[PDB]
Tab-separated table of C-alpha atoms and ligand atoms in Angstrom:
chain	number	residue	atom	x	y	z
Y	30	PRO	CA	0.000	0.000	0.000
Y	31	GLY	CA	0.976	3.663	0.246
Y	32	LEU	CA	1.974	5.913	-2.676
Y	33	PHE	CA	5.544	6.975	-3.462
Y	34	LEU	CA	6.008	10.344	-5.184
Y	35	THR	CA	9.172	12.267	-5.947
Y	36	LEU	CA	10.137	15.767	-7.049
Y	37	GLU	CA	13.159	16.502	-9.220
Y	38	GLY	CA	14.929	19.403	-10.871
Y	39	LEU	CA	17.887	21.694	-10.701
Y	40	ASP	CA	18.824	23.725	-7.670
Y	41	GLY	CA	16.381	26.745	-7.674
Y	42	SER	CA	13.742	25.027	-9.841
Y	43	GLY	CA	11.034	25.206	-7.165
Y	44	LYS	CA	10.888	21.519	-6.617
Y	45	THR	CA	11.367	22.019	-2.803
Y	46	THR	CA	8.540	24.552	-2.685
Y	47	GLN	CA	6.315	22.172	-4.610
Y	48	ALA	CA	7.170	19.135	-2.441
Y	49	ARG	CA	6.130	21.060	0.668
Y	50	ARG	CA	3.037	22.534	-0.937
Y	51	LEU	CA	2.000	19.045	-2.051
Y	52	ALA	CA	2.535	17.520	1.395
Y	53	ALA	CA	0.333	20.182	2.971
Y	54	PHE	CA	-2.293	19.819	0.242
Y	55	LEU	CA	-2.583	16.094	0.778
Y	56	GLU	CA	-2.612	16.414	4.518
Y	57	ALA	CA	-5.495	18.894	4.242
Y	58	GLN	CA	-7.416	16.150	2.452
Y	59	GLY	CA	-6.919	13.954	5.539
Y	60	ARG	CA	-4.228	11.760	3.992
Y	61	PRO	CA	-1.331	10.465	5.984
Y	62	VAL	CA	1.828	11.921	4.446
Y	63	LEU	CA	5.549	11.562	5.016
Y	64	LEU	CA	7.704	14.315	3.521
Y	65	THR	CA	11.411	13.540	3.186
Y	66	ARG	CA	14.427	14.485	1.077
Y	67	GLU	CA	17.790	13.507	-0.310
Y	68	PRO	CA	20.548	13.930	0.493
Y	69	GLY	CA	20.224	13.366	4.219
Y	70	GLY	CA	16.916	11.521	4.724
Y	71	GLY	CA	18.868	8.325	5.306
Y	72	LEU	CA	22.189	9.453	6.757
Y	73	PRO	CA	22.046	13.112	7.804
Y	74	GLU	CA	25.863	13.250	8.045
Y	75	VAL	CA	26.230	12.539	4.342
Y	76	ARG	CA	25.860	16.256	3.652
Y	77	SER	CA	29.172	16.819	5.477
Y	78	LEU	CA	30.921	14.088	3.483
Y	79	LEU	CA	29.577	15.444	0.171
Y	80	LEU	CA	31.399	18.752	0.740
Y	81	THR	CA	34.803	17.079	0.705
Y	82	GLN	CA	37.216	19.013	-1.527
Y	83	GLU	CA	38.151	17.346	-4.834
Y	84	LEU	CA	35.854	14.410	-4.304
Y	85	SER	CA	35.893	11.930	-7.187
Y	86	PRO	CA	32.559	11.564	-8.938
Y	87	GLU	CA	32.542	7.837	-8.064
Y	88	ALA	CA	32.968	8.621	-4.369
Y	89	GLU	CA	30.330	11.319	-4.675
Y	90	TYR	CA	27.795	8.870	-6.081
Y	91	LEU	CA	28.658	6.214	-3.540
Y	92	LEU	CA	27.939	8.729	-0.728
Y	93	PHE	CA	24.570	9.644	-2.258
Y	94	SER	CA	23.903	5.910	-2.575
Y	95	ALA	CA	24.762	5.141	1.055
Y	96	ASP	CA	22.292	7.781	2.165
Y	97	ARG	CA	19.696	6.464	-0.289
Y	98	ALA	CA	20.092	2.886	0.951
Y	99	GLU	CA	19.438	3.943	4.544
Y	100	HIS	CA	16.637	6.269	3.429
Y	101	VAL	CA	14.748	3.569	1.541
Y	102	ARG	CA	15.084	1.017	4.345
Y	103	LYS	CA	14.490	3.124	7.404
Y	104	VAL	CA	12.216	5.879	6.166
Y	105	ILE	CA	10.469	5.333	2.834
Y	106	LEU	CA	9.582	1.606	2.844
Y	107	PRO	CA	8.240	1.773	6.427
Y	108	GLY	CA	6.164	4.853	5.526
Y	109	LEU	CA	4.704	3.163	2.475
Y	110	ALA	CA	3.992	0.026	4.553
Y	111	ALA	CA	1.840	2.139	6.880
Y	112	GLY	CA	-0.196	3.400	3.891
Y	113	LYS	CA	1.330	6.871	3.768
Y	114	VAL	CA	1.851	9.006	0.751
Y	115	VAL	CA	5.649	9.343	0.880
Y	116	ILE	CA	7.016	12.385	-0.941
Y	117	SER	CA	10.758	12.670	-1.468
Y	118	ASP	CA	12.367	15.927	-2.519
Y	119	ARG	CA	14.957	14.211	-4.748
Y	120	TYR	CA	15.528	10.503	-5.234
Y	121	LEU	CA	17.546	8.264	-7.592
Y	122	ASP	CA	16.862	10.410	-10.655
Y	123	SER	CA	18.961	13.135	-9.041
Y	124	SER	CA	21.966	10.825	-9.123
Y	125	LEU	CA	21.281	9.771	-12.674
Y	126	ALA	CA	21.052	13.397	-13.788
Y	127	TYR	CA	23.874	14.874	-11.665
Y	128	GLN	CA	26.350	12.002	-11.373
Y	129	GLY	CA	25.416	10.377	-14.669
Y	130	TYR	CA	24.710	13.115	-17.209
Y	131	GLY	CA	26.522	15.812	-15.231
Y	132	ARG	CA	29.688	14.092	-14.000
Y	133	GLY	CA	29.758	11.501	-16.799
Y	134	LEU	CA	29.534	8.294	-14.732
Y	135	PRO	CA	28.170	5.281	-16.596
Y	136	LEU	CA	24.393	4.966	-16.158
Y	137	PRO	CA	24.428	1.136	-16.084
Y	138	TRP	CA	26.826	1.181	-13.128
Y	139	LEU	CA	24.727	3.816	-11.376
Y	140	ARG	CA	21.711	1.552	-11.822
Y	141	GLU	CA	23.472	-1.574	-10.637
Y	142	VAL	CA	24.587	0.165	-7.468
Y	143	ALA	CA	21.080	1.461	-7.036
Y	144	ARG	CA	19.311	-1.822	-7.515
Y	145	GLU	CA	20.354	-3.078	-3.952
Y	146	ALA	CA	20.419	0.455	-2.533
Y	147	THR	CA	16.817	1.064	-3.444
Y	148	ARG	CA	15.625	-2.590	-3.319
Y	149	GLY	CA	14.093	-1.698	-6.709
Y	150	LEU	CA	11.686	0.841	-5.202
Y	151	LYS	CA	10.495	3.327	-7.876
Y	152	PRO	CA	8.112	6.239	-7.446
Y	153	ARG	CA	4.687	6.034	-9.060
Y	154	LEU	CA	5.083	9.583	-10.347
Y	155	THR	CA	8.039	11.946	-10.479
Y	156	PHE	CA	7.364	15.660	-10.959
Y	157	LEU	CA	10.253	17.234	-12.822
Y	158	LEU	CA	10.467	20.984	-12.559
Y	159	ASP	CA	12.318	21.847	-15.761
Y	160	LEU	CA	14.365	25.007	-15.214
Y	161	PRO	CA	16.672	26.698	-17.734
Y	162	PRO	CA	20.214	25.823	-16.671
Y	163	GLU	CA	21.397	29.431	-16.285
Y	164	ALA	CA	18.700	29.989	-13.647
Y	165	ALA	CA	20.188	27.257	-11.432
Y	166	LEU	CA	29.573	19.856	-4.543
Y	167	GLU	CA	32.347	21.282	-6.706
Y	168	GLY	CA	32.220	22.285	-10.378
Y	169	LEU	CA	28.519	23.185	-10.515
Y	170	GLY	CA	28.976	25.616	-13.403
Y	171	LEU	CA	26.888	26.355	-16.458
Y	172	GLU	CA	28.263	23.521	-18.653
Y	173	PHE	CA	27.474	21.074	-15.869
Y	174	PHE	CA	23.976	22.444	-15.326
Y	175	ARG	CA	23.210	22.265	-19.038
Y	176	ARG	CA	24.182	18.576	-19.010
Y	177	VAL	CA	22.038	17.962	-15.906
Y	178	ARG	CA	19.043	19.837	-17.257
Y	179	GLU	CA	19.138	17.899	-20.532
Y	180	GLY	CA	19.791	14.684	-18.670
Y	181	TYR	CA	16.654	15.104	-16.632
Y	182	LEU	CA	14.714	15.663	-19.876
Y	183	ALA	CA	16.225	12.473	-21.300
Y	184	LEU	CA	15.231	10.501	-18.225
Y	185	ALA	CA	11.696	11.876	-18.595
Y	186	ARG	CA	11.492	10.897	-22.278
Y	187	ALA	CA	12.698	7.379	-21.354
Y	188	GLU	CA	10.019	6.851	-18.673
Y	189	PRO	CA	7.167	9.020	-19.933
Y	190	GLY	CA	4.533	7.376	-17.724
Y	191	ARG	CA	6.461	8.044	-14.528
Y	192	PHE	CA	7.735	11.544	-15.244
Y	193	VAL	CA	5.539	14.609	-15.345
Y	194	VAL	CA	7.551	17.496	-16.821
Y	195	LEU	CA	6.526	20.958	-15.653
Y	196	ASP	CA	7.798	24.359	-16.726
Y	197	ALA	CA	9.562	25.646	-13.625
Y	198	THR	CA	9.226	29.235	-14.850
Y	199	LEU	CA	5.417	29.150	-14.381
Y	200	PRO	CA	3.838	30.729	-11.261
Y	201	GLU	CA	4.150	28.486	-8.218
Y	202	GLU	CA	0.384	28.182	-7.813
Y	203	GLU	CA	-0.094	27.079	-11.442
Y	204	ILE	CA	2.580	24.414	-11.013
Y	205	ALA	CA	0.870	23.219	-7.830
Y	206	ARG	CA	-2.477	22.965	-9.563
Y	207	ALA	CA	-0.873	20.902	-12.345
Y	208	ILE	CA	0.700	18.511	-9.800
Y	209	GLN	CA	-2.662	18.186	-8.036
Y	210	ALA	CA	-4.441	17.392	-11.279
Y	211	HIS	CA	-2.033	14.576	-12.091
Y	212	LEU	CA	-2.618	13.106	-8.633
Y	213	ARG	CA	-6.386	13.254	-8.371
Y	214	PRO	CA	-6.915	9.900	-10.187
Y	215	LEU	CA	-4.467	8.172	-7.791
Y	216	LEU	CA	-5.847	9.810	-4.576
Y	217	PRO	CA	-9.651	10.216	-4.745
X	26	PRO	CA	55.336	0.392	-12.177
X	27	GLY	CA	54.957	0.019	-8.406
X	28	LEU	CA	53.794	-3.047	-6.556
X	29	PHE	CA	50.478	-3.223	-4.698
X	30	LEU	CA	50.256	-5.519	-1.656
X	31	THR	CA	47.479	-5.909	0.924
X	32	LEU	CA	47.065	-7.417	4.366
X	33	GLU	CA	43.775	-8.893	5.520
X	34	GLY	CA	42.279	-10.615	8.556
X	35	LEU	CA	40.202	-10.103	11.607
X	36	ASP	CA	41.022	-7.107	13.801
X	37	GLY	CA	43.776	-8.263	16.088
X	38	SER	CA	45.181	-10.735	13.624
X	39	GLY	CA	48.499	-8.842	13.491
X	40	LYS	CA	47.988	-7.622	9.967
X	41	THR	CA	48.706	-4.127	11.258
X	42	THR	CA	52.070	-5.153	12.936
X	43	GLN	CA	52.983	-7.130	9.803
X	44	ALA	CA	52.312	-4.175	7.531
X	45	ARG	CA	54.812	-2.190	9.611
X	46	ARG	CA	57.408	-4.989	9.587
X	47	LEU	CA	57.002	-5.372	5.817
X	48	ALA	CA	57.505	-1.683	5.155
X	49	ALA	CA	60.612	-1.773	7.388
X	50	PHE	CA	62.001	-4.720	5.402
X	51	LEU	CA	61.492	-2.843	2.181
X	52	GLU	CA	63.056	0.312	3.631
X	53	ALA	CA	66.151	-1.744	4.578
X	54	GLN	CA	66.398	-2.872	0.909
X	55	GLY	CA	66.171	0.758	-0.195
X	56	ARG	CA	62.809	0.226	-1.841
X	57	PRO	CA	60.406	3.195	-1.759
X	58	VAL	CA	57.268	2.212	0.191
X	59	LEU	CA	53.953	3.705	1.186
X	60	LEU	CA	51.953	2.302	3.984
X	61	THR	CA	48.194	3.020	4.050
X	62	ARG	CA	44.959	1.567	5.424
X	63	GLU	CA	41.198	1.271	5.157
X	64	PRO	CA	38.912	2.590	6.370
X	65	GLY	CA	39.940	6.228	6.349
X	66	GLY	CA	42.770	6.290	3.772
X	67	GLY	CA	40.341	8.010	1.384
X	68	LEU	CA	37.785	9.785	3.549
X	69	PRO	CA	38.827	10.042	7.203
X	70	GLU	CA	35.336	11.241	8.000
X	71	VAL	CA	33.854	7.931	6.880
X	72	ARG	CA	36.012	6.096	9.429
X	73	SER	CA	34.963	8.391	12.259
X	74	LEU	CA	31.245	8.137	11.249
X	75	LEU	CA	31.303	4.346	11.131
X	76	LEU	CA	33.107	4.236	14.499
X	77	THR	CA	30.054	5.681	16.234
X	78	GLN	CA	27.130	4.652	14.085
X	79	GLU	CA	25.722	1.520	12.689
X	80	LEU	CA	23.754	1.433	9.475
X	81	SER	CA	22.179	-1.143	7.160
X	82	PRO	CA	24.901	-3.328	5.657
X	83	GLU	CA	24.174	-1.819	2.217
X	84	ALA	CA	24.765	1.693	3.474
X	85	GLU	CA	27.810	0.533	5.432
X	86	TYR	CA	29.303	-1.035	2.292
X	87	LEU	CA	28.573	2.044	0.214
X	88	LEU	CA	30.426	4.233	2.711
X	89	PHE	CA	33.405	1.853	2.753
X	90	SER	CA	33.262	2.004	-1.062
X	91	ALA	CA	33.237	5.830	-1.162
X	92	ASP	CA	36.283	5.818	1.095
X	93	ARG	CA	37.917	3.183	-1.119
X	94	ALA	CA	37.227	5.181	-4.279
X	95	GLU	CA	39.024	8.185	-2.813
X	96	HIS	CA	41.766	5.994	-1.356
X	97	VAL	CA	42.561	4.369	-4.697
X	98	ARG	CA	42.585	7.638	-6.603
X	99	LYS	CA	44.296	9.988	-4.199
X	100	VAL	CA	46.678	7.651	-2.359
X	101	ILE	CA	47.268	4.237	-3.906
X	102	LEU	CA	47.424	4.944	-7.647
X	103	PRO	CA	49.663	7.982	-7.172
X	104	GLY	CA	52.020	5.942	-4.981
X	105	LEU	CA	52.178	3.163	-7.542
X	106	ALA	CA	52.735	5.714	-10.318
X	107	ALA	CA	55.797	6.964	-8.475
X	108	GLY	CA	57.163	3.391	-8.395
X	109	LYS	CA	56.467	2.736	-4.736
X	110	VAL	CA	55.491	-0.486	-3.127
X	111	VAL	CA	52.124	0.422	-1.709
X	112	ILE	CA	50.920	-1.691	1.226
X	113	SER	CA	47.338	-1.353	2.364
X	114	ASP	CA	46.138	-2.684	5.719
X	115	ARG	CA	42.699	-3.771	4.393
X	116	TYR	CA	41.256	-3.386	0.928
X	117	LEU	CA	38.262	-4.744	-1.027
X	118	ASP	CA	38.550	-8.237	0.472
X	119	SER	CA	37.613	-6.680	3.840
X	120	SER	CA	34.257	-5.608	2.442
X	121	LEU	CA	33.730	-9.013	0.853
X	122	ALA	CA	34.486	-10.770	4.161
X	123	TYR	CA	32.637	-8.401	6.528
X	124	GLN	CA	29.762	-7.034	4.453
X	125	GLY	CA	29.467	-10.107	2.176
X	126	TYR	CA	30.143	-13.234	4.188
X	127	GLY	CA	29.541	-11.598	7.555
X	128	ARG	CA	26.409	-9.482	6.889
X	129	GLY	CA	25.095	-11.447	3.899
X	130	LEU	CA	25.299	-8.998	1.035
X	131	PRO	CA	25.559	-10.626	-2.385
X	132	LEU	CA	29.153	-10.868	-3.598
X	133	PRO	CA	28.503	-10.263	-7.285
X	134	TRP	CA	26.826	-6.952	-6.449
X	135	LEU	CA	29.666	-6.028	-4.089
X	136	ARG	CA	32.107	-6.710	-6.877
X	137	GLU	CA	30.123	-4.700	-9.446
X	138	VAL	CA	30.025	-1.718	-7.117
X	139	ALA	CA	33.719	-2.122	-6.544
X	140	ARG	CA	34.706	-2.385	-10.179
X	141	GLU	CA	34.327	1.455	-10.627
X	142	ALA	CA	35.286	2.349	-7.117
X	143	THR	CA	38.636	0.635	-7.518
X	144	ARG	CA	39.148	1.274	-11.244
X	145	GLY	CA	39.800	-2.451	-11.252
X	146	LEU	CA	42.973	-2.153	-9.157
X	147	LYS	CA	43.832	-5.484	-7.569
X	148	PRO	CA	46.756	-6.349	-5.280
X	149	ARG	CA	49.457	-8.581	-6.648
X	150	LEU	CA	49.582	-10.465	-3.320
X	151	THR	CA	47.334	-10.403	-0.280
X	152	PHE	CA	48.564	-11.757	3.045
X	153	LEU	CA	45.719	-13.196	5.094
X	154	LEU	CA	46.516	-13.392	8.804
X	155	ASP	CA	44.237	-16.288	9.756
X	156	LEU	CA	43.161	-17.121	13.334
X	157	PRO	CA	40.011	-17.938	15.265
X	158	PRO	CA	38.163	-14.912	16.641
X	159	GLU	CA	38.965	-16.089	20.215
X	160	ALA	CA	42.664	-15.806	19.398
X	161	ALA	CA	42.554	-12.249	18.094
X	162	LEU	CA	44.812	-10.177	20.202
X	163	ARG	CA	42.451	-7.292	19.720
X	164	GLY	CA	29.141	-16.546	22.915
X	165	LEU	CA	26.522	-15.603	20.277
X	166	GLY	CA	28.491	-12.512	19.231
X	167	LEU	CA	31.310	-14.797	17.973
X	168	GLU	CA	29.044	-16.133	15.136
X	169	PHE	CA	29.495	-13.010	13.005
X	170	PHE	CA	33.275	-13.150	13.438
X	171	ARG	CA	33.409	-16.809	12.494
X	172	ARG	CA	31.480	-15.972	9.302
X	173	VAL	CA	34.056	-13.312	8.515
X	174	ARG	CA	36.976	-15.634	9.323
X	175	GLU	CA	35.551	-18.399	7.152
X	176	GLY	CA	34.701	-15.880	4.442
X	177	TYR	CA	38.330	-14.829	4.242
X	178	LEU	CA	39.383	-18.468	3.939
X	179	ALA	CA	36.826	-18.934	1.167
X	180	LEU	CA	38.195	-15.911	-0.689
X	181	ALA	CA	41.697	-17.287	-0.308
X	182	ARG	CA	40.930	-20.736	-1.654
X	183	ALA	CA	39.201	-19.165	-4.682
X	184	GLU	CA	42.315	-17.132	-5.548
X	185	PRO	CA	45.324	-19.147	-4.470
X	186	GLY	CA	47.617	-17.195	-6.789
X	187	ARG	CA	46.868	-13.934	-5.007
X	188	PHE	CA	46.373	-14.954	-1.381
X	189	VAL	CA	49.021	-16.191	0.995
X	190	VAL	CA	47.428	-17.537	4.162
X	191	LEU	CA	49.522	-17.373	7.357
X	192	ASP	CA	49.029	-18.839	10.821
X	193	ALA	CA	48.505	-15.515	12.686
X	194	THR	CA	49.020	-17.238	16.055
X	195	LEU	CA	52.768	-17.799	15.211
X	196	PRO	CA	55.383	-15.488	16.615
X	197	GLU	CA	55.532	-12.115	14.963
X	198	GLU	CA	59.071	-12.451	13.610
X	199	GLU	CA	58.303	-15.816	12.080
X	200	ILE	CA	55.238	-14.485	10.288
X	201	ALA	CA	57.346	-11.566	8.972
X	202	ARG	CA	59.989	-13.923	7.631
X	203	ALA	CA	57.315	-15.996	5.845
X	204	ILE	CA	55.897	-12.807	4.240
X	205	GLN	CA	59.374	-11.845	3.113
X	206	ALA	CA	59.994	-15.252	1.582
X	207	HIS	CA	56.759	-15.015	-0.425
X	208	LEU	CA	57.570	-11.522	-1.572
X	209	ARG	CA	61.203	-11.863	-2.631
X	210	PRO	CA	60.469	-13.419	-6.032
X	211	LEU	CA	58.303	-10.352	-6.904
X	212	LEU	CA	60.814	-7.551	-6.184
Q	4	TMP	C1	20.094	13.506	-4.139
Q	4	TMP	C2	21.170	14.098	-4.965
Q	4	TMP	C3	21.454	15.435	-4.968
Q	4	TMP	N1	22.470	15.943	-5.712
Q	4	TMP	C4	22.819	17.346	-5.623
Q	4	TMP	C5	21.648	18.244	-5.935
Q	4	TMP	C6	22.013	19.524	-5.225
Q	4	TMP	O1	23.009	20.255	-5.932
Q	4	TMP	C7	22.673	18.973	-3.972
Q	4	TMP	C8	21.766	18.937	-2.738
Q	4	TMP	O2	22.321	19.971	-1.905
Q	4	TMP	P1	21.478	20.311	-0.588
Q	4	TMP	O3	21.643	19.175	0.379
Q	4	TMP	O4	22.125	21.604	-0.125
Q	4	TMP	O5	20.070	20.559	-1.012
Q	4	TMP	O6	23.163	17.645	-4.273
Q	4	TMP	C9	23.266	15.118	-6.478
Q	4	TMP	O7	24.226	15.562	-7.110
Q	4	TMP	N2	22.954	13.821	-6.504
Q	4	TMP	C10	21.986	13.235	-5.775
Q	4	TMP	O8	21.808	12.003	-5.830
Q	5	TMP	C1	37.862	-1.667	5.064
Q	5	TMP	C2	36.722	-2.288	5.819
Q	5	TMP	C3	36.702	-2.403	7.189
Q	5	TMP	N1	35.682	-2.948	7.845
Q	5	TMP	C4	35.705	-2.960	9.306
Q	5	TMP	C5	36.481	-4.088	9.924
Q	5	TMP	C6	36.730	-3.545	11.303
Q	5	TMP	O1	35.593	-3.856	12.109
Q	5	TMP	C7	36.838	-2.053	11.070
Q	5	TMP	C8	38.250	-1.540	11.044
Q	5	TMP	O2	38.138	-0.167	11.362
Q	5	TMP	P1	39.215	0.575	12.313
Q	5	TMP	O3	40.470	-0.267	12.229
Q	5	TMP	O4	39.234	1.916	11.645
Q	5	TMP	O5	38.797	0.568	13.775
Q	5	TMP	O6	36.303	-1.763	9.785
Q	5	TMP	C9	34.570	-3.432	7.177
Q	5	TMP	O7	33.616	-3.912	7.812
Q	5	TMP	N2	34.566	-3.387	5.840
Q	5	TMP	C10	35.550	-2.823	5.115
Q	5	TMP	O8	35.486	-2.766	3.862
Q	6	CL	CL1	14.518	23.734	-5.448
Q	7	CL	CL1	45.235	-6.334	13.075
Q	8	MG	MG1	21.836	5.172	-5.606
Q	9	MG	MG1	12.948	10.785	-8.467
Q	10	MG	MG1	22.658	-1.673	-14.942
Q	11	MG	MG1	37.270	-8.251	13.390
Q	12	MG	MG1	34.289	-1.224	-2.748
Q	13	MG	MG1	42.972	-7.255	0.063
Q	14	MG	MG1	31.301	-17.452	6.128
Q	15	MG	MG1	35.838	-21.083	4.731
């Protein structure tokens, strides 16, 4: 039971605002909700480790993955088991976009790591707030953000049932209404 | 060129003393040497975090792997590139023994994770300091340690061209001499 939803996008895309808005919206309907986030929902100390100077992209991903593994096991799966709507502000797609398309790590390896880390748990829907890259860890420059932005769009084209792509430049309340509309058939 | 060697075993198996004796031997022969260790050779902060917290074995392994990825890139490969003999007290086999055999994680997955983390770097020889957990110099709790001990022995018998298994209960100087004898053909 339960319903697993995620929000994705660049830094500054509004996906945090929308995750919180959505949690409150659902709670106002009387639904049990668990709002969480990555990095840090699993292992809060990972945020310290991720700041390490000159971190290799492989190490970077492995840190995100350690947090994710703890997050899935200790937070998300137990929430879903209790019938909650679990909303994560970022999940595996963030790694695929940032560490895969951004840093250049091989997607198949990212997925193999992830398969045990996540126990195969995938969100039902993922709301991608698509932000122009100039409107957006070391080396987070414009070239990187272009790769990440386009990578997210690629992920969305590859799983077009799961991803809902939203124009992050729209007013926050219009974005929220669009998210709500996509959810109504799942949450009567 | 360099030469990459590792030491493995339970904590308190002497592998730490033997790493020091081996580096001293090599220093006496005028051979440049770098001694290092896991966890913490890559990300000290991982070592200190794992000292005081316990996680799922998957998360545990992924933290050891992040440390290892940094260790290989920033410490081991540069030492080998300079022509040093690099000796690590613990490497990937520790994860296989502790997280794999001990905590039950699947070995093929561990090895797939590792393949990128390590850039495929494997030691030329690994000295396993074998002893029962009750003999380690540093009972339901013993079951985990026996799984790890037996896991190391299983790793060793699968790769008899890489592992050298030593009686860790022997006197320290005798173990060191046996390590030296195994190494001399490779120098
Ligand atoms: C979850 C996740 C986030 N990130 C990035 C997105 C943001 O730049 C940053 C999160 O920083 P924050 O903890 O300050 O919000 O980490 C990744 O690179 N990969 C991931 O897997
Ligand atoms: C390198 C490594 C160590 N360990 C454990 C074995 C010991 O319990 C501990 C050694 O840490 P310490 O020597 O820093 O105290 O780390 C693993 O479980 N897996 C690993 O991959
Ligand atoms: Cl945001
Ligand atoms: Cl030891
Ligand atoms: Mg992952
Ligand atoms: Mg997601
Ligand atoms: Mg794969
Ligand atoms: Mg031990
Ligand atoms: Mg590893
Ligand atoms: Mg080894
Ligand atoms: Mg065993
Ligand atoms: Mg055995």
